[PDB]
């Protein structure tokens, strides 16, 4: 069963998520307006930049994350940011029309909008399939936040110094998740759920890879790099 520390961990992550994900998406109005080439780059660049700040806020609240060095926190965030953004976006994703519904029409994104940011189907196609598969899992919010925290605290991220500590932190979360599924997630919805959730992490690595490739390509062009933000440039890379 769920020890007291594990119940604590879940409580902390649930709160952290609630403090970094505003389901009313009220802040989307402060972003440069969407334009429906690469007409969506300014808007999505701001949205992404905003999301990076939110992911960081979540990360810092992950039990143990702070005990990591400055350099390790930085490495973990830079490598996971895009993945957590994709993962957290499953909350706004809807299988009705395969789009992300963030309140209003101006703030509802589809394949077209993402391509209007410069990306191709090489990324978008597997991204939609990912959203669908993750959505099909019908995760409890508890599982959702544990998955994002586990994604951030990954020992194999290149450049990790104290990988041992990173694994220790991640294990604590993994065990919390495995136990939670057994204690709180009822069958059949729990059938191989952990294994399936971990597979989603693997899918995120290839998505991360394809996004990076396309990001380097897009940002290599000064006129596009000009449309980004300082945070996006520092975190995702600056030619």
């Amino acid at each position: 069963k769920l020890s007291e520390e594990q119940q604590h961990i879940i409580a902390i992550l649930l709160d952290a998520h609630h403090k970094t994900y505003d389901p009313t998406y009220a802040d989307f109005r402060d972003f440069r307006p969407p334009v429906r080439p690469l007409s969506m780059l300014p808007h999505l660049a701001d949205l992404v930049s905003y999301s990076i700040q939110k992911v960081i806020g979540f990360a810092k609240m992950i039990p143990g994350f702070r005990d990591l060095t400055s350099d390790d926190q930085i490495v973990l965030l830079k490598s996971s940011a895009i993945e957590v953004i994709m993962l957290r976006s499953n909350q706004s994703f809807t299988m009705d029309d395969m789009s992300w519904d963030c309140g209003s029409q101006d703030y509802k994104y589809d394949v077209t909008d993402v391509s209007k940011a410069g990306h191709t189907l090489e990324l978008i196609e597997p991204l939609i399939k990912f959203q669908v598969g993750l959505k099909k899992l019908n995760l409890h919010e508890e599982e959702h936040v544990l998955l994002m925290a586990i994604c951030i605290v990954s020992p194999d991220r290149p450049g990790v110094q104290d990988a041992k500590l990173v694994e220790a932190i991640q294990d604590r979360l993994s065990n919390t998740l495995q136990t939670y599924i057994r204690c709180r997630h009822p069958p059949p919805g729990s059938h191989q759920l952990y294994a399936k959730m971990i597979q989603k992490l693997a899918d995120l690595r290839s998505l991360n890879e394809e996004h990076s490739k396309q990001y380097r390509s897009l940002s290599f062009q000064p006129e596009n790099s000009m449309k980004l933000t300082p945070l996006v440039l520092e975190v995702f890379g600056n030619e």
Partner: peptide
């Protein structure tokens, strides 16, 4: 080397 991220982390 990562000013903004650093600031956001502390």
């Amino acid at each position: 080397n990562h000013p903004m991220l650093m600031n956001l982390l502390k």
